[PDB]
Amino acid sequence: SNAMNFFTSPFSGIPLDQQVTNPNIIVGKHSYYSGYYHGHSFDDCVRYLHPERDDVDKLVIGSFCSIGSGAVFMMAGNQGHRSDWISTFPFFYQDNDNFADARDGFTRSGDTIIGHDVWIGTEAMIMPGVKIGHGAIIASRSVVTKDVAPYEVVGSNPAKHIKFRFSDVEIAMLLEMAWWNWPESWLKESMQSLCSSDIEGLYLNWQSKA
Amino acid sequence: SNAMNFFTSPFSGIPLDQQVTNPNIIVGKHSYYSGYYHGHSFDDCVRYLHPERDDVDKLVIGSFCSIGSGAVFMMAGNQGHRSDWISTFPFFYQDNDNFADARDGFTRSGDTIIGHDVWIGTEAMIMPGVKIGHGAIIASRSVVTKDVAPYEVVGSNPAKHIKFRFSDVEIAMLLEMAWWNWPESWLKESMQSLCSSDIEGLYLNWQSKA
Amino acid sequence: SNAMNFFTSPFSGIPLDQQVTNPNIIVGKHSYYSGYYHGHSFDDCVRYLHPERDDVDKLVIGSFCSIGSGAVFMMAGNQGHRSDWISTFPFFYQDNDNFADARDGFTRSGDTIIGHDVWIGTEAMIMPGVKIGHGAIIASRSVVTKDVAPYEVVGSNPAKHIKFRFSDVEIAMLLEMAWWNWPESWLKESMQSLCSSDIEGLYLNWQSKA
Ligand SMILES: CN(C)c1ccc(C(=C2C=CC(=[N+](C)C)C=C2)c2ccc(N(C)C)cc2)cc1
Ligand SMILES: CN(C)c1ccc(C(=C2C=CC(=[N+](C)C)C=C2)c2ccc(N(C)C)cc2)cc1
Ligand SMILES: CN(C)c1ccc(C(=C2C=CC(=[N+](C)C)C=C2)c2ccc(N(C)C)cc2)cc1
Ligand SMILES: [Cl-]
Ligand SMILES: [Cl-]
Ligand SMILES: [Cl-]
Ligand SMILES: [Cl-]
Ligand SMILES: [Cl-]
Ligand SMILES: [Cl-]
Ligand SMILES: [Cl-]
Ligand SMILES: [Cl-]
Ligand SMILES: [Cl-]
Ligand SMILES: [Cl-]
Ligand SMILES: [Cl-]
Ligand SMILES: [Cl-]
Ligand SMILES: [Cl-]
Ligand SMILES: [Cl-]
Ligand SMILES: [Cl-]
């Protein structure tokens, strides 16, 4: 058949919970990664995450997330580089008798936590320990060095505030609704509402039901 | 012979009209792409451009263009992500019975139009629908999210104004001359002038001939 | 054995003087490159550096340097593109009878010099002719278009000043000490001091010995 069968969708992709093999990566349902233009699966988007240790920083990703091609998740902390020390060269991790009495410069940064309904643009890099709130949008080629508020749009290198998707009242409504945790039958009933800007109307409907 | 035969030139490269296979990519003569450090041809620099549909955004590139290695041309619009909607997750493009009544969130951005004599730095990303005027210079690692004026130099992420190559009078002279549309014999006669900053002198010469 | 044997360390890597084949690349001892997530060795991090000519810009890298994965070193000057000329299209490097009388637009930028104890973040791009002082830190995804002072931290695209690692007195102490040139026995004795922020204490100790 056509050469289109070789390609993958720009609007869709392989779900995360159908390709992740690293046990230190927690992913929610329906979250996918469309990485045709970088070959490797999502496991290789996560850099230097030890898959056999339980005392390392973890990568947690919510549900209904969209991750563009070539996204990078740094998961090794400072990688043994102490800027406050005299040298950033990791003497502790070079097998050399002259470096025997070096101190370990590795420092954890905490878990990298991606919320629900997060849109991560293509080739965006997420620094270790970064928390990204629900509904946030990471622009393409962004370098996220700080936390991102829920439903906040950020971009540039380093990532800085661009705008909020909705007003504070609407954001509060979505955070209380938490449609990502609704039963599958509720999403099927509210597909037309979820594909619109009418947050206040859906919030009033959700109040009567629950 | 030497290992240099395996390499490709940093000053030159394979012309675009000698390697482009996607019919939705319009390229001018002499425009080339030097992509040794990214392997793939120029067709893979253009991301998610359907090669079998005539109702999609097209990529138009002028003549005498220089495109560095790893340049990216996003050609899929918003890829079904509506930031103004409640969720950016493209329910319409996931085959799931619970998403049957979703609305299509895809929105075209218009054709990406690259003018004549455009220098695109290596690993620069061009967002969908961006128009770049004649003679503009795209710095390396740029993320061009807005239109670029003729003979404007832009850089950074997102791309912002750096400078104009020449004065407004000189730019007007070059836009009226349009040497990229001259016969091949006129360029051969004016090779020494085209390789200099003497725009006003060449404009006076072109007035007497035409 | 384990799948960990296939991987390489994020804290360490193959030393530069154990993998560099290009004779126009001068590297110091202990400097390494950890490029697991980009496949190629350090020779392919250096772009368009002619390995058989002695009249080109050279890449000089000091000792005890840490280079992240995917770092890029542009080593071809302007690549024949003269922005001050009428056209940036390199007519001189296209074999065409109509371009026979073109002038050479190539211009060298000088040697790219990386000092000692320089930490270069992953996927950072170094423009041609850039000098980076001792102890500087190049943040990830940086585009270094200008010189970097010793022990200066820079980031963003284009790279701009973030901070200095230490005070002017401490920087002067480290530049006079130059521990990267100490005998191997001196580093083994001062491993605990090099893995700390006590620059002034080590400077007082070094004064008594030398
Ligand atoms: C150049 N390249 C590698 C391509 C080429 C085409 C695509 C696909 C596509 C492109 C543009 C569209 N619009 C403008 C509406 C819609 C779909 C596509 C292909 C297959 C597919 N499936 C297998 C379901 C889904 C989408 C992706 C990458
Ligand atoms: C490291 N690497 C992969 C390389 C190595 C060398 C080159 C080439 C080159 C480099 C520097 C030059 N100057 C400083 C003047 C001029 C030419 C080159 C090679 C072949 C070629 N042709 C086949 C025509 C044209 C140019 C490119 C990539
Ligand atoms: C996912 N992936 C490709 C990986 C997975 C694991 C690593 C390694 C590692 C990761 C996290 C660590 N901590 C949090 C302390 C410590 C070491 C590692 C592996 C081998 C090795 N050697 C061969 C010496 C040294 C380090 C690197 C890449
Ligand atoms: Cl993508
Ligand atoms: Cl969260
Ligand atoms: Cl994207
Ligand atoms: Cl923070
Ligand atoms: Cl901000
Ligand atoms: Cl290039
Ligand atoms: Cl145009
Ligand atoms: Cl370039
Ligand atoms: Cl615009
Ligand atoms: Cl601007
Ligand atoms: Cl790295
Ligand atoms: Cl130096
Ligand atoms: Cl790094
Ligand atoms: Cl400078
Ligand atoms: Cl600055």
Automatic annotation (TrEMBL), chains A, B, C:
GO terms for biological process: response to antibiotic. SUPFAM superfamilies: Trimeric LpxA-like enzymes. GO terms for molecular function: acetyltransferase activity; chloramphenicol O-acetyltransferase activity. Keywords: Acyltransferase, Antibiotic resistance, Repeat, Transferase. Acetyl-CoA binds at residues 140, 145-146, 163. It catalyses: chloramphenicol + acetyl-CoA = chloramphenicol 3-acetate + CoA. It is an enzyme of class 2 (transferase). Its EC number is 2.3.1.28. It comes from the Bacteria. InterPro entries: Hexapep, Hexapep_transf_CS, Trans_hexapeptide_repeat, Trimer_LpxA-like_sf. PROSITE patterns: HEXAPEP_TRANSFERASES. PANTHER family: ACETYLTRANSFERASE, CHLORAMPHENICOL ACETYLTRANSFERASE. Belongs to the transferase hexapeptide repeat family. This is Chloramphenicol acetyltransferase. It comes from Vibrio cholerae serotype O1 (strain ATCC 39315 / El Tor Inaba N16961).
